[model samples]
Target: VETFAFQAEIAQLMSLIINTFYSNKEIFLRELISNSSDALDKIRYESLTDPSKLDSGKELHINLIPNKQDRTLTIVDTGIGMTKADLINNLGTIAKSGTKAFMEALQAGADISMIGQFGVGFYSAYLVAEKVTVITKHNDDEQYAWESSAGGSFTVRTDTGEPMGRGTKVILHLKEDQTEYLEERRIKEIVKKHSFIGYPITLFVEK
Candidate 1:
């Protein structure tokens, strides 16, 4: 529904990553889970006053389902989903300084703790996924899909798929050379290491 050029800094950042940080690939999952947790927290607060903001049942959680045949890793969260503009500003820009506002709120005793200050951490998915598809629906907007190969740009379109209600589903099309993330054991270890305590992340796999 929207199209725009990435900030100049975005190109510089991508090229820098391509030239560095491949050894620390597992950080991608940690950061992504952190983001999902933050989104869930946001909606949880919104529901406190608006109650109706909660999608249907209003349970907050994360789901990790791996597809071996398709070699895709799907991460879903019943959290504060992003609108089309959010996808552009969040995914297509290098605006890390926004965390300062969150930090200020923390100092003022607001009950919110969000990980990944720089916001660029989401791009880390590019290290393992040649293509990343994000399907999201915010209470304020219709469902839509944002997709890209982490190349020069990404595209957005109205999603014809079933409504997500109020959340996001990120589908990672793993690279042939990057298969460890497809294994439950590996994902379990990563979840244990970084997101074991605070977030409720469930891992799903084929029987």
Candidate 2:
């Protein structure tokens, strides 16, 4: 059995995710993919009740695109997209969770839970992107775009792109210092290492 707590040491935990734990910024793409997979699973479960809610036009997969020309990294998935409130709640407050307790539990030889169950991975984008955007359209809701610089504030609004079919596309405006992640081979290696767990993942290439 496991014990769960809702409160955490916010300041110390933010420092860790933004600095220490994510020192290797390449892991950010994998983290986003992991999130996309989970969101897909959630939608699959939801569709059981409202079968028509599923996206009929798109394949279920995660796509990673590296644009070295623009120093941009894009992660797209045809999973459940977030509404505006979901963006604020998920990316803002949930970024910090289970810090002191998880550390203490690890010190006491307890199992380590995965990070970002409470939304820490969203900040991982800042490890590489100076500006990050989430373009999403829900199956039954209006389309929206959310943008943030990971600078303690964000903005969201309806999108102009053709309705998103149903999914999320996270675009990372890469920082010059983290350009290695913009390389093709490196991106493939990261995806294979973390996401080759019997799921279909595609990479978009500049053609």
Candidate 3:
């Protein structure tokens, strides 16, 4: 499905990975935070070649927001966000719908290499999220929202609600039992572990 479909195999695969792959759900914060760092660094270096890249004038920072009323935990990065193509290529396919060879290769035995190959760590959100929303605006491409649930497929649609200026926003509609992720202490616990990262991480707690 272009705008809306995740192949059954991919859906099944995602479900399997979410339920079995991660030993610790808290690791999701680290992976996503590290991803922000990577993207933030990219914008800095890319601007050396094209000044327009850094034109957003937005400082490089990562923000985590927890809204108890909505039961949503959000991760925002003032870094080089994604384009429509990036969203589709990176998030929509579940690494890849390489169904032909993917199914063929994994048929022998599920290997761990594919996870590393595609950086599927992004999928870790499924560990706690029932639905995840990704709003990204790259310097080169227009803005869009790439959303998906733990089951079903992902979609990329035009979003003009508000300007992102630049970078990405990941909002997780957490499952009922996974409310801990929205806790201030829990977020601090996870983010504090990544002190080595250069960008500033600030979290807003909303009751």
Candidate 4:
């Protein structure tokens, strides 16, 4: 519905990430996959508790589309999408997360194992992207586009685009140096190395 500055700590944390996350930028993909899986699990679990949550009837799976011409990569999941409030607070601010413990832990000493916890994992996208756009539609709320440059603020507006029946679409406008992710072969190898991925993740490419 509007634009807002990110949490006060986000800028500092992103700058720290810029310096530390050099060699393993690929982990960003795995982290996003995990995030989608979490959302999918949420929908599945919610449906069990209250059958109405599954009204969308769409099959749940994660899809990755990398477009070379646009230098953009989209991570899509037919999971429980976000309401307007969800996108506003969850992504805009580091809500209900361990941002403090992380900065302290990083400054105290490095903890590679901490990669998957806290807001740090999601913000890892900045390691490769100059801009990030999220289009999400929840069953109860209207579709919206949440865009951010991590320049301390983000925008959320009513989106007239795809507006898929359900789920979230995260599009990354890749940085010039990160175009390597646009390659099919490179993505295949990276997603292959991550062993914990349970749901099917299909990368769009020439067959």
Best candidate per lDDT, number? 4
Worst 10 residues of 3 by lDDT: 112-121
Look at candidate 3 and give me any clashing residue pairs: none
lDDT of each: 0.75, 0.67, 0.76, 0.81
Stretches of candidate 3 off by over 4 Å are: 7-10, 21-23, 90-94, 97-118
lDDT tens string, model 2, 59-140?
6777888888888888888777787656645444544444555545545764323444444555557667778888987765
Tens-place lDDT per residue, model 1, 97-156, is 544444454457643223245565666677788788999999888889988775567788
User: How close to the true structure is residue 181 of candidate 1, measured as C-alpha lDDT?
Assistant: 93
lDDT of 3 by residue, 1-207 (tens): 246667566676667655664456776677677778888999988988888888885589999999888999999998999887677665446456553354455567855334423455566677778888999889888888888875666888888779989998999899898899988998988887733578889999674
What's the ranking of the predictions by lDDT, best on top? 4, 3, 1, 2
Pairs of residues at least 3 apart in sequence or in different chains that clash in candidate 4:
none
RMSD values for the candidates in order, in angstroms, are: 6.3, 6.4, 3.9, 2.1
Displacement of the residue 109 alpha carbon in candidate 2, Å: 14
For this target, which candidate reaches the highest TM-score against the unseen true structure?
4
Q: Model 1: how large is the Cα RMSD against the reference?
A: 6.3
Candidate 1: give the clashing pairs: none
User: Where is model 2 more than 4 Å wrong at Cα?
Assistant: 1-22, 55-58, 90-114, 117-119, 196-198
Residue 97's lDDT within candidate 4 is 52
Model 2, position 130, has a per-residue lDDT of 76
